[PDB]
Structures are given as C-alpha cells and as structure tokens.
Design a binder for this molecule. Structure first.
Ligand SMILES: *[C@@H]1O[C@H](CO)[C@@H](O[C@@H]2O[C@H](CO)[C@@H](O[C@@H]3O[C@H](CO[C@H]4O[C@H](CO)[C@@H](O)[C@H](O)[C@@H]4O)[C@@H](O)[C@H](O)[C@@H]3O)[C@H](O)[C@H]2NC(C)=O)[C@H](O)[C@H]1NC(C)=O
Ligand SMILES: *[C@@H]1O[C@H](CO)[C@@H](O[C@@H]2O[C@H](CO)[C@@H](O[C@@H]3O[C@H](CO)[C@@H](O)[C@H](O)[C@@H]3O)[C@H](O)[C@H]2NC(C)=O)[C@H](O)[C@H]1NC(C)=O
Ligand SMILES: *[C@@H]1O[C@H](CO)[C@@H](O)[C@H](O)[C@H]1NC(C)=O
Lengths: 66, 50
C-alpha cells in the first residue's frame, strides 16, 4: 500500500500495487485482514471515512438503518 | 485451522495459524473455499451458527 500525493492539500490518494512494480489500485477489503492491536504507525481514523478511503468497503450496519 | 482447548468447557476456539509458525487468529470468510462434495471427515452443523 502507498499514499499517492500527501496531505499538503488534503489529498492522500491511497493505492496498492506490487512491491517491485508500479501497479496502482485502490486498496480493497478482500486484500486485508483485521487485528485487535494498534500502534502509532497505524494511521488512525473514524468509521465514516472507511468507505471514503475504501469504496470497496460496505457498511451494512449504517446502510440498513437508512 | 485448529481447535485450541477442548469442548470440556463449551468453548471451542477455532483459529487459523501458519503451519510453519503458530500465529492463532480467527479466520476471515473471504479466505475459505466452498465445496459441493461432503465426506465423513467434515464437521456437521446448520446454517444458524455460520
Ligand atoms: C490514533 O491512534 C494512534 C496510534 O496508532 C495514536 O498515536 C498515539 O498517540 C498518543 C497521543 O495522541 C500517544 O500517547 C501519548 O504519549 C505521550 C508520551 O509521553 C512521553 O513523552 C512525554 C513528552 O516527552 C513525557 O513528558 C512523558 O513522561 C513520556 O515520557 C504522553 O505524554 C501522552 O500523554 C500520550 O499518552 C501514543 O504514544 C501514540 N501511540 C504510540 C504507539 O506511541 C494517535 O494519537 C491517535 N489519534 C489521536 C488524535 O490521538
Ligand atoms: C456428519 O454427518 C454424517 C452423516 O450424518 C456422519 O456420518 C454418518 O454416520 C452414520 C452413523 O454411523 C452412518 O450411518 C451408518 O452407516 C453404517 C455403514 O457405514 C451402517 O453400518 C449403520 O447401520 C449406519 O447406517 C452414515 O453412513 C455416515 N454417513 C456419512 C456420509 O458419513 C458423520 O459421522 C458426521 N460427522 C460429524 C463430525 O458431525
Ligand atoms: C448495525 O449497527 C447500527 C448501529 O451502529 C444499528 O443501528 C443497526 O441496527 C445494526 N444493524 C445490523 C443489521 O446489525
């Protein structure tokens, strides 16, 4: 995973590719796993921006109540 | 996937770890495979507990 551009203009485009080659793509839910431990290196964030950072993410909880 | 501990206390913890390195963790659904063929070796259950 990598961050195209920086937060200088509040646009940190999150992409993923191979370590060797440049194959940009938005990170996907199927690409990752969940852990119960956290550290400073982990960027910290709220739930509402998860679809914003991961459009591939779908929050069934917050869509059903609508 | 292994069952650490036993059913002696009504708590069977299903965790997946690397065969090379014991790293217990609850498996993710995207990582399994669905099969049409069943044999006696598979654990029986109903859809409720999936
Ligand atoms: C979102 O999650 C991030 C984790 O991925 C958070 O990073 C953690 O940020 C908190 C504070 O925001 C840190 O906790 C602080 O630690 C300092 C360290 O104290 C030492 O240094 C001071 C100054 O030199 C000294 O006076 C002390 O005696 C200590 O020697 C504390 O002073 C603070 O009170 C506070 O506890 C965490 O350390 C940091 N994570 C890690 C793993 O270090 C991030 O902060 C979160 N988001 C927000 C907005 O906070
Ligand atoms: C999961 O379920 C299957 C099927 O419900 C279980 O296997 C079944 O076990 C029964 C009990 O022994 C078998 O019936 C018996 O078959 C023998 C012939 O092999 C016969 O002598 C007996 O009179 C009786 O009919 C059944 O054939 C067998 N079927 C299969 C597909 O395995 C299995 O034990 C269960 N396992 C778990 C972990 O829940
Ligand atoms: C999902 O969680 C929200 C609160 O976060 C709750 O209002 C809703 O009923 C939940 N829906 C389901 C299907 O769990």
């Amino acid at each position: 995973l990598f961050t195209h551009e920086l937060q200088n203009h509040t646009a940190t485009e999150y992409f993923v590719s191979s370590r060797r080659m440049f194959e940009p793509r938005k990170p996907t839910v199927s690409d990752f796993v969940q852990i119960e431990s956290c550290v400073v290196t982990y960027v910290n964030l709220t739930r509402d921006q998860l679809p914003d950072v991961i459009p591939d993410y779908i929050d069934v909880n917050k869509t059903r109540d609508e």
